[PDB]
Write a protein that binds this DNA or RNA. Structure first.
Ligand SMILES: Nc1ncnc2c1ncn2[C@@H]1O[C@H](COP(=O)(O)OP(=O)(O)OP(=O)(O)O)[C@@H](O)[C@H]1O
Ligand SMILES: Nc1ncnc2c1ncn2[C@@H]1O[C@H](COP(=O)(O)OP(=O)(O)O)[C@@H](O)[C@H]1O
Ligand SMILES: Nc1ncnc2c1ncn2[C@@H]1O[C@H](COP(=O)(O)OP(=O)(O)O)[C@@H](O)[C@H]1O
Ligand SMILES: [Mg+2]
Ligand SMILES: [Mg+2]
Ligand SMILES: [Mg+2]
Ligand SMILES: [Zn+2]
Lengths: 310, 482, 391, 104, 478
DNA sequence: CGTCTGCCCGCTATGAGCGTTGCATTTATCAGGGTTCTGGTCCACAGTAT
DNA sequence: ATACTGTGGACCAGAACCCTGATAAATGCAACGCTCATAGCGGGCAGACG
C-alpha cells in the first residue's frame, strides 16, 4: 500500500487496518489482505495481533513507528507482559514480528484462552462522542477491549451488540457513524468500575516492560505481604480471614460476573493457588484483585516494582 | 536408457514366440548367477604409504564399494527371475491375424462340427510377495545390485512399445496413501523421458483415480516388476488406520499383471496379518524372511561368517597391520554385532577410522569396545532386544537405526585432518617452558640469529634460575653467539 | 515523480493557517515578476556561428521546443490557477479532522453504488471549475504545462503519510466510452506515483457506478488538487446517451467530491457543453496601431538566428509579410520562421527575406494552404465551414 | 485504447526512436469505422511519449488527413515531402539527373 | 581466456589413462601441498612500525584481504573438489566410443555370445554452513591451481575446467540460467548468449540448450554460490525450488556444487534426509571454530590466534596474550571467521586514536556494543545454541563495510596532539637506530635513554647496527 | 404489349463493445489418533495435644 | 518431651481438543456468444423502347 494511515493514541492496529480498508475503497476482504499483507492466509485477531512488521514497513518513512512501539502502545501485550516472566515475554516479543499466528496465542500459558470469552464487538456511550468531537472518526480503543472486564475505566459499562470474530474471520470491521447507542441506561457496579480504573494505568507506563518479576519471586512476595499483614500463623492460610478480607472489597455477585467466583468451601481455588507455590503465569485479574484486597493504599506501578525488587 | 532389442531362443516351450521375454538377458544358469554380485575395492599394495586424508576417504568409501554375496541371495535372485519372466504370459504382443481364426472358430462351433472353443484372452494371474526382515540386514542395496543385471528399458524396432523391467519406489519419512501414487509417477518420469507426472498425477484426482491410471500406464508398456520399499516409514496416524492400509495394498488386482513386491520390517508384519484373504494375496507365493547371521547353525560354526570376516579383514588399510586374525576379535565382533549386516561393517569402519585419530595404528578388541560405548547410543534397543531374544521386544524396537551417522563420519574425518599438522620449527619453540621469556625471543631473533639462540637461552635460564628477564639480556651475545 | 519531503511555510491569510497540504506549496509569485519567471529562450552563444554546417543546422530545429514568450493572458491564467488550486484545500483539512469526513463518506458511496449518498451532514466541499477554449494553434497544451511546472506534482508529508499529488492531467479517449476516463485516470495516477492502481481497480469485472465512485474516492485518498482534462472534443463521437453522463459527472465531482476540475477543448466543443475563458490568436492591430505584444514577440524571435549574415533592424514590409502568412495563429509563426531558416541554409543564401518566406511557405506547408488561404480570405461562410476555426 | 496504452509502456521501456507506418493505402475503409475513425485513431497517437512517427501513402490517401486543422497540423510537422516522377525539362535544358540515371 | 597449450603427463591412476581431457590438469604429486600453500602472511619488517601512523593503519586495513589461515576444514574441501572434478571426466573420453555403444555391445555379448553377464549400471554436492564462515573466498583461491581454459590442438575442443556463478538480491531461476552463459562468455569471449539466451525461451527449453553446450564443451565443474540471496516467493513454492535444481543436476551430467546457508537446507531437506547415495546431494557442514574441543581448548584456535597476534602494529603494545582477552572473543564473536578478524582490525584502529597504544579486553566491549550492531540476533542465536534460531536468523551480512573502512582511514587525520612516544621519536633524528629504543623500552626510562642515544649517535664509533648494538647498551647502562 | 438494363434496399457480411458461462479453483466438511491439560493423589513433613 | 492431623510439593492417568488427511461442493474468471452499428451488394421492381 502507498498511503497507510497512522494510528491514533490508544487504538488497536486492527482498527487502523480497517480504516486503511475504508479509506481506499476496498470492500472485498481478500483484496484487503492482498494489499495490506500480500497473502490471503492471515487471521484477524483483536489483541496480540500477528504478522506485525509488515504493518511497520508501510510506516517506514515515519521513523517513530517500529515493532516495539506498535507492540507496546497499539496492542494488548503490555497487560500480559510483566506477569508471564522474562524469557517467555522476550520470546513472545521476538515472535510477534514473524509470520506465526497461533504460536503467539499458544506460547503464553496465560494467553492460552482456547475458546473466546465473549469475543463480540463493544463500545462506550460517551467515548464515541468524544472521539468524534476530537478526531472525526471512531475506532476500537484499547480501553474498551479488556480481556475479561466489560467496563470502561472512566465510564459505567460497555454496550455489546451483534457479530463476533469467530463468525466472519477475514474481515477487519470499523465502526463509523451509522450505528450508535440507542437511548437506554445500562446498570453498572461501582466496584467493577473502580477495579477497571485501578488496572487501566498498566497499558501506558514507560517501565511496564522491564518490571517483570521472575517465577520464584511471586510466592516470596505473597509470603512477605502475608507476614507483614500478619494473617498467617505459621505457613498457614486462615481459610476465613483472607476470604473476609477479599469480601470486604468485592462481593459474590461482582465476582460471579467476572467468572472469578470464590470457592472458600472447596480446597482448590485461585486464591489458594496464589497462596501456594506458583506453577504457571496467572491472569492480570487475579493478581490485581489479590493486591487490591490485601493492600488498598498503593497503585499498580509501585506495587509491581516492590514485588520485583525484593 | 533405451537399449535396442535382439532376441534369443529359450529352452522353455511356454515362451516359444513371446517377444517380451526373449528381449531380456538369458535365463540364469544358477551356477554363477550371484557370482557377479561379488564386489571388492582394489586395495592395491601401493596405497598403504599414502596421506591420511586419502586413506580416510577410502575408509569412508568402503561401505559403498563392498558387497559380499551370501548363500541366501541365490533364492531371492531365483524368485525374482521366476516372477519377472513368468508374469508375461498374459501380455504377449505376438498375436497374428486372430480375426480369421476367431471367425473360423465361430463358424465351425455353430454348424455342429465343433462343440466348444475358448475365445477369451483375459488370462493374467498376478503374483505378490513380501520381503520381511530386521532393519539393517540389507534389503535395499542387496536388491538394487540384483536388479541392476536386468536392463530397465528395452526398445523394439518393429513395434513402438517399451518394457520397463523394474521400477523402484521408496516412501517418504512421514508417508501417506497418496505419496506412493505420486512417487510412481515421479520414478517413471525419471526412468524414461516423458511428462507422465504432470499429465496424469494431478492433485484433483482421488486415490482410486491414480490407482486406476496406474493400470493404464503399466499396461501400455510391458512392466515386469513394481518394488514398493520401506513401508515401515508410513505414518499410521497420517494414513487413516491399521485396516484401510491393508485394504489399499490388497487392491493390486485392478492393475493387470505387474507382480508387486513389498519390503518391510516385522513392525508391518503384524499390520499385514489380520485375515485370510490379505495374508493370501499380499504374500501370494511365500514370504522370504531375512534373519541376522549366526556363528553356527549346525554343530560346526558357519563358514559364511568366517569367509565374510576374512574378506572384510583383508580389505584393511593401515601402516601397522597384523595378518593373523585372533579368534577373540571374531568373538567380540559376534558378541557386539550379533550378525546384523549393517552394524558389523559400520563398526569396523569406525574402528579403522578412529585408529588413525588415536595414532595407535592397530585394531584391538578393546578399541572396538570403546567405540561401541562411545558412538553407537541410539542402536542399543536393537542390541538388548536381540540379546534377550524376546519376539515382542524385537518387534517393538525393529524400526530404529543410528541417525546422521554420515555427519559423524565427516566430523571424524575433519578431526583427523586437523590433527595432522605438525611443525618442525615449532619443535624448537616447544622446549620453551618458562614463558614471558618469549618477549626476548620475539624481539631479539627477528633481525638476529635464529639457529642457536632458541636452544642456548634454555641453558642460560637453567644455569641461572635465580634471575628474571631484564639483565639476562646484556651478555646474551658473548655467552651464546660469540 | 519528484518525491520531496515538504517543509512548511506560514502564509498571511487566516483561512490557510494550519493546513499541511497548502502550506507545502510554493508561494504565489507577484505578477510583476511572474512574467519574467515564465520567460525561457535558447542559450545561443556566438561560438556556433563559426562551426560546421550540419551541427549548426541541427540546433535551429530546437527553437520550437525551447522558446516561450509570456503574454497578457498568461498572468490571468496563472492567477486563476493559483486561486482555483488554493480554494480546493480549505475543506479537506487533515489536521483538524475534515478529510476523514470527506473520505468516510466515499466508502458508503462504493458500498451502496450511488454517488449522492452522504453520512456526515457537515462535510462541505469547496471547489471550482473552469473551461479554457481557444483557437487551435494558441498553446493551451504547453502554456498550461509551463504554468503547472512550478508545482512539483507529488510532494510527501512527514507527520501524516499522505503523498499529495498537486495536479494530474489526463486525455479523453477517442471512443468516448464511459470506461476509459476511469482507466486512463488510473494510468496517470500510477505513472507519476510508481504504484499499480489499474491492476486493482480496472482488471476486475466491475460495473460503471462502482468504477465511477472508486476514482472519486482514490482522488481523495491522495489530496489531489487539480484534475485537468485535455481534448474534451472526443465525447461528441461517443455512443448515444453517453455524452451527457460525463457532463453531469464532471459537475457532480466538482460540487460533491470537491476535487477541482479544469477542462480544455477545441473550439468545436462549445455546442456539446462553471466559468468560461476564451483565447484568441494574436492580432497585431488593436485599434489603429501595431501592438506592443506582437512587436516584442517578433523583435525577440529575431535574435534566435544562426545565419552567417543578417540585418540590424526588421522592416515593416517583412513584418507585414510574416503577419499575412501567419494570419495570427501562434504555432505557424515559429514553424514558418524555422522552415525559412532551414530552406535558407539548404539553398546557400545566408539571408532571410519576404520572398524567401513566401516560397518556403508555398513549398513546405502543402497540407496547410487550404485553411490558411481560408483564414486569409476571411469569408464568414468559409470560417463557419470546417471545424475549430477562430470566430 | 488498451493496446494503444500498452504501446506507451512498450515504447518507454525501450527508447524507441522512429515508428514509421507504410502502406496506409492498403487500408479498407469499411472494416474500421470510417474516415473520421481513421483520423481520430491516427491523432490519438499524440499521447504516446516521444517516438516520432512518419506517415506514408498515395496522393489519394491525402484526402483523409485534411480538412481538420489539428489533423492537418500533426500531418505536416516538419513540412511536406512530395515524391514525384522525374520530369525531363524543369528548366529549358533537360534535367541532368534524368540523363545520369538513364546513362547509368 | 587464460589459454594454456595442453601438455600430456602420466598419471598413476589406471582409470584416467588415455583420456585427453584429464592429463591436461596439474599432476597429483605437486597438488598435495598446493592447498596448504594458500597460507599467506602480510610480513613486515620492524622498521615498518617506526613509520607514520597512517602507513601502519593502511597496512593493517589490508589484513581482512591478505590474511588466510587454512584449517582442518579447508584441506578436506580442496581434496574433495579435486577428486570430484577429476572423477567427472571418466565418461567423456574422445578416444573411446560412447557409453551407449558400450552398453549395446555388452548386451549383445550377454546375449547369444559366450559371456557370463554384464552390469547395466550408470554426484552433486552442497556446501551449507553458517554465513560468514569463509566459503566463497576459500573456493576462489582453492580453484586457482586449475587453469580455467585449456586449449587442445590435436582436436578442436576448448576444455573449460571450471566455471563459477554468483547470484544477486531477490533473483529467480532465470537469472542464474542466464548468468551461466554470462560467466561462460566471460571465460571464452564468444557470443554464447547473444542469440542463445533470448527472452522467448522458457525454462525447460533454456535448460535443454544448457545441457548440449555443457556436454559438447569439455566442462568439469559448475559451482553456484550465494543461493541464499535467491528470492523464494518470486520463484514460487519450495517444491519447484527443489525440482529445478534436481532437473538441472540430472540432465547436464557434470559434477555440480552448491554453496549456501542453512536457510536452503530446509529447501533441500527432501532427497537429503533419507540416505540416497545414488541420487547424490552429499552434505558437508561448516561450523564456527569451537574453542572447546572435548573439554580442552582447540589447537586450531590457539594457532590462528597466535598467528593473528604476532602481526599487530602498535607502539606500547602488550605483545603477549592473556586467557581473558582470548576468552572474550568467543563470547563477543562466537568464533565465526567473518567478525573475529573484523573485531581485531576495528580494535586496532580504535586503539590507534582513542588512548594508550595497546590492545585490552575492555575496548573490545566498546567495539561490540557500539559498531558491530546488526548481527546481534545471529550472535544471540549462536550463544543460545538452538538450531532453529541459528537457521532462521542467518543471511545478514552487515553491509556498507567499504564506507566504514574509508571513513576510519580518513578519521585519523584530525589528531593534532602528539603522544610523548612518537613526539620523542620525531624530535630525535630519524636514523632508524630506534630499533634499540623499541627493544629496550620496558627496562629503563626514556628520559635516561633517548638523550643518551642522541649523544652517542652524535659520535657513533662505527656505522654498523645490530652487530654494534651491545656497545651502546654498555654506554646505556652506565 | 414483352423485356432488358440501371437503381436500391432489404438484405449480407463484419468490426467493436458488452453479457452469459464451463471451468478448474478454491473452499468447506467430516472421521480419527495423539498430546498436553487438568484432575485428584499421596507421601513426606511442620505443628500440635497427650 | 512424642503420635496425630492438616498441608505443601512432586506426581499417574483419563479426557477434550486439535492438527490432518481424504472427500464433496460453492465459485470468480477469463472464454466465447450476443447484439448493435456500419458499409457494400445483387436480384427484383418501376420503367421505357422495339
Ligand atoms: N506564447 C507563445 N510563446 C512561444 N511559443 C508559443 C506560444 N504559444 C504557442 N507557442 C508554440 O506553438 C506551439 C503550441 O503548442 P501546441 O501545439 O500544444 O498548441 P495548441 O495548438 O494550442 O494545442 P492543442 O493540442 O491543445 O490544440 C508550440 O510549438 C509552442 O512552442
Ligand atoms: N552383502 C553385503 N555386503 C556388504 N554390505 C552390505 C551387504 N548387505 C548390506 N550391506 C550394508 O547395508 C547398508 C544398506 O542397508 P539398507 O539398504 O539401508 O537397509 P534397509 O534395506 O533395511 O533400508 C549398506 O551400507 C551396506 O554396506
Ligand atoms: N582462512 C581465513 N583466514 C583468515 N581470514 C579469513 C579466512 N577466510 C575468510 N577470512 C575473512 O573473512 C572475511 C569475510 O569472508 P567472506 O568472503 O565474506 O566469506 P563468505 O563469502 O563465506 O561469507 C574476509 O574479510 C576474510 O578476511
Ligand atoms: Mg529399508
Ligand atoms: Mg493539446
Ligand atoms: Mg561470498
Ligand atoms: Zn468509555
Amino acid at each position: 500500500m502507498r498511503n497507510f494511515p497512522v494510528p491514533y493514541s490508544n487504538e488497536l492496529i486492527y482498527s487502523t487496518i480497517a480504516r486503511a480498508g475504508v479509506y481506499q475503497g476496498i470492500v472485498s476482504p481478500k483484496q484487503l489482505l492482498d494489499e495490506v499483507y500480500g497473502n490471503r492466509k492471515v487471521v484477524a485477531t483483536l489483541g496480540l495481533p500477528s504478522h506485525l512488521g509488515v504493518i511497520a514497513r508501510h510506516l517506514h518513512q515515519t521513523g517513530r513507528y517500529a515493532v516495539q512501539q506498535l507492540i507496546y502502545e497499539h496492542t494488548l501485550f503490555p497487560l500480559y507482559a510483566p506477569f508471564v516472566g522474562k524469557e517467555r515475554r522476550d520470546e513472545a516479543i521476538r515472535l510477534m514480528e514473524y509470520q506465526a499466528q497461533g504460536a503467539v496465542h499458544l506460547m503464553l500459558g496465560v494467553a492460552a484462552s482456547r475458546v473466546k470469552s465473549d469475543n463480540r464487538f463493544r463500545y462506550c456511550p460517551d467515548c464515541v462522542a468524544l472521539q468524534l468531537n476530537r478526531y472525526g472518526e471512531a475506532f476500537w480503543q484499547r480501553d474498551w477491549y479488556l480481556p475479561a472486564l466489560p467496563y470502561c475505566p472512566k465510564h459505567g459499562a460497555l454496550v455489546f451488540f451483534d457479530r463476533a470474530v469467530d463468525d466472519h474471520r477475514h474481515q477487519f470491521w470499523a465502526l463509523g457513524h451509522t450505528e450508535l447507542l440507542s437511548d437506554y441506561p445500562k446498570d453498572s457496579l461501582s466496584q467493577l468500575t473502580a477495579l477497571a480504573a485501578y488496572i487501566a494505568p498498566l497499558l501506558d507506563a514507560p517501565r511496564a516492560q522491564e518490571l517483570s518479576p521472575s517465577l520464584e519471586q511471586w510466592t516470596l512476595f505473597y509470603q512477605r505481604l502475608a507476614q507483614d499483614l500478619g494473617l498467617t500463623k505459621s505457613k498457614h492460610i486462615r481459610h476465613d480471614l483472607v476470604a473476609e478480607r477479599v469480601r470486604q472489597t468485592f462481593s459474590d455477585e461482582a465476582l460471579e460476573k467476572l467468572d472469578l467466583k470464590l470457592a472458600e468451601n472447596k480446597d482448590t481455588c485461585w486464591l489458594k493457588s496464589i497462596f501456594r507455590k506458583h506453577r504457571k503465569a496467572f491472569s492480570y485479574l487475579q493478581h490485581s484483585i489479590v493486591w487490591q484486597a490485601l493492600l488498598p493504599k498503593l497503585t499498580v506501578i509501585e506495587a509491581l516494582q516492590q514485588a520485583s525488587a525484593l | 536408457t533405451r537399449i535396442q532389442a535382439v532376441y534369443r531362443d529359450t529352452g522353455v516351450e511356454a515362451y516359444r514366440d513371446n517377444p517380451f521375454i526373449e528381449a531380456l538377458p538369458p535365463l540364469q544358469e544358477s551356477v554363477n548367477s550371484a557370482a557377479s554380485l561379488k564386489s571388492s575395492l582394489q586395495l592395491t599394495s601401493s596405497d598403504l604409504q599414502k596421506s591420511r586424508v586419502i586413506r580416510a576417504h577410502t575408509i569412508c568409501r568402503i561401505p559403498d564399494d563392498y558387497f559380499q554375496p551370501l548363500g541366501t541371495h541365490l533364492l531371492l535372485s531365483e524368485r525374482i527371475s521366476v516372477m519377472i519372466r513368468g508374469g508375461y504370459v498374459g501380455r504377449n504382443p505376438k498375436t497374428g491375424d486372430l480375426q480369421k481364426h476367431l471367425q473360423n472358430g465361430y463358424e465351425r462351433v455353430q454348424t455342429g462340427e465343433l462343440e466348444t472353443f475358448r475365445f477369451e484372452e483375459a488370462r493374467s494371474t498376478a503374483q505378490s510377495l513380501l520381503l520381511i526382515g530386521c532393519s539393517g540386514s540389507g534389503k535395499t542395496t542387496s536388491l538394487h545390485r540384483i536388479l541392476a543385471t536386468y536392463p530397465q528399458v528395452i526398445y523394439h524396432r518393429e513395434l513402438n512399445v517399451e518394457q520397463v523391467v523394474y521400477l523402484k519406489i521408496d516412501c517418504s519419512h512421514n508417508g501417506s496413501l497418496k505419496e506412493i501414487c505420486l512417487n510412481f509417477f515421479r520414478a517413471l518420469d525419471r526412468a524414461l523421458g516423458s511428462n507422465y507426472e504432470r499429465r496424469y498425477g494431478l492433485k484433483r484426482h482421488g486415490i482410486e483415480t491414480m490407482l486406476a491410471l496406474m493400470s493404464q500406464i503399466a499396461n501400455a508398456h510391458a512392466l515386469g516388476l513394481l518394488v514398493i520399499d520401506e513401508i515401515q516409514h508410513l505414518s499410521r496416524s497420517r494414513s487413516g488406520g491399521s485396516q484401510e492400509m491393508l485394504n489399499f495394498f490388497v487392491t493390486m488386482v485392478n492393475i493387470i499383471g505387474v507382480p508387486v513386491m513389498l519390503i518391510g520390517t516385522p513392525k508391518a508384519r503384524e499390520i499385514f496379518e489380520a485375515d485370510l484373504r490379505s495374508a493370501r494375496r499380499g504374500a501370494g507365493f511365500g514370504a522370504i524372511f531375512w534373519d541376522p547371521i549366526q556363528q553356527t547353525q549346525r554343530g560346526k560354526p558357519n563358514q559364511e561368517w568366517i569367509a565374510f570376516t576374512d574378506n572384510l579383514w583383508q580389505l584393511q588399510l593401515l601402516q601397522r597391520k597384523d595378518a593373523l586374525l585372533s579368534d577373540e576379535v571374531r568373538d567380540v565382533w559376534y558378541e557386539l554385532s550379533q550378525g546384523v549386516m549393517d552394524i558389523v561393517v559400520k563398526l569396523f569402519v569406525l574402528a579403522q577410522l578412529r585408529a588413525l585419530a588415536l595414532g595407535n595404528e592397530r585394531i584391538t578388541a578393546g578399541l572396538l569396545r570403546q567405540v561401541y560405548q562411545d558412538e553407537l547410543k541410539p542402536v542399543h534397543p536393537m542390541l538388548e532386544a536381540l540379546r534377550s531374544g524376546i519376539p515382542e521386544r524385537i518387534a517393538r524396537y525393529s524400526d530404529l537405526v543410528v541417525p546422521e551417522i554420515d555427519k559423524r563420519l565427516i566430523q571424524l574425518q575433519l578431526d583427523i585432518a586437523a590433527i595432522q599438522e605438525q611443525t618442525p620449527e615449532e619443535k624448537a619453540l616447544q622446549e620453551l617452558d618458562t614463558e614471558d621469556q618469549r618477549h626476548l625471543y620475539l624481539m631479539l631473533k627477528e633481525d638476529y640469529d635464529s639457529s642457536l639462540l632458541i636452544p642456548t637461552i634454555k641453558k642460560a635460564f637453567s644455569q641461572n634460575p635465580t634471575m628474571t628477564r631484564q639483565k639476562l639480556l646484556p651478555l646474551v651475545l658473548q655467552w651464546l653467539m660469540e
